[PDB]
Design a protein around this ligand. Sequence first.
Ligand SMILES: CC(C)C[C@H](NC(=O)[C@@H](NC(=O)[C@@H](N)CNC(=O)c1nnn[nH]1)C(C)C)C(=O)NC[C@](O)(CCc1ccccc1)C(=O)Nc1cccc(C(=O)O)c1
Length: 365
Amino acid sequence: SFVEMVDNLRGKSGQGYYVEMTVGSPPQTLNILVDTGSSNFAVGAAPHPFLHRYYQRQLSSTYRDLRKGVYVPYTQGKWEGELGTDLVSIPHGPNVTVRANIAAITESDKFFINGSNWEGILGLAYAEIARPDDSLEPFFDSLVKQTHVPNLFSLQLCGASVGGSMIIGGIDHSLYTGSLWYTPIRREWYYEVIIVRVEINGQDLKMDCKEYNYDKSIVDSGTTNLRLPKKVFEAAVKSIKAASSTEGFWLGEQLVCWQAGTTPWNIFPVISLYLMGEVTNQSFRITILPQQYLRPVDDCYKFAISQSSTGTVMGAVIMEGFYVVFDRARKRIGFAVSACHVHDEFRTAAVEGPFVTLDMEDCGY
Ligand SMILES: CC(C)C[C@H](NC(=O)[C@@H](NC(=O)[C@@H](N)CNC(=O)c1nnn[nH]1)C(C)C)C(=O)NC[C@](O)(CCc1ccccc1)C(=O)Nc1cccc(C(=O)O)c1
């Protein structure tokens, strides 16, 4: 039941959230990064200087080889390895065992992070973006096909040492407040959504909404940042600079620092994303505070908004403080402020609707 799954995720800031899983017979225990921006279940299966532990296929009696290699590239990092299948379970998830596809990772470049403490990646999106091709059924599909776990999951990620919940199979009503607001998954590959308006401190950014979605906007819990397309990224920074003109960093390369507890939170604006809703001409908005897009790294911070080579990418930083529901069953993603919400002296992060927005169809690429 859901109480066993609450707080089943861990992290280091800016390095991802993982969940304990076990693979094989007998079970090998591994920490697996939870990723909504990809679709391959893969694990280190070979010594690496950043891996404390890895998958030993030859120790497992249920491992079957598929005699077939694979390569997977990501925003940061890439790996290749051998596809097989094996028995998989989630200790603090639903009480089941599935046979799932598994990529034994043999070579990697910039993929494993030093001191990250995860040793694998669970892609939670759809077959279509699965390597080598869409016939390699992704973990979540196998789980839904082979057991009675309903076709949906929720992510509640929290910031500082980093924790949260993956409610697999449902929604835990105690982990958020107010109502859940939904947005169509435009297409079942990435968790693709449409952003229809963007406001900075209450001011519309005045751009054509095709710009926000230049290519595709996605919810990617495997990336840290809020990534905006060039044109939008440039407008955002110009607004954020102006709102904070009162005080290199803007490119995310270097930290800024303040004497413990005097972070001038008030001089940094709130950003509002309006997402397409479930009814005609209707949207809703999520409001993000400086405390989300200035990443805790004296209290020090990295700027967590960077330039994108796709559309708008809602990374780990935007999801922090929200309860997000991946309602695959009904082709929608749900947003609410969670229990572990962001704390500011004079403002709240919020999920507010309904809003009316004409011509939302125009914003799609
Ligand atoms: C580097 C990354 C953005 C590549 C991209 N990878 C992914 O999307 C992976 N997911 C992720 O990386 C996630 N962080 C979420 N997605 C994004 O951030 C994002 N998607 N698009 N832009 N950004 C998985 C879904 C595998 C991909 O597979 N893209 C598809 C493709 O464009 C196809 C290219 C191709 C050309 C001709 C025939 C067939 C395919 C791609 O490989 N692109 C691509 C671009 C640059 C480098 C590399 C590389 O291998 O190093 C690959």
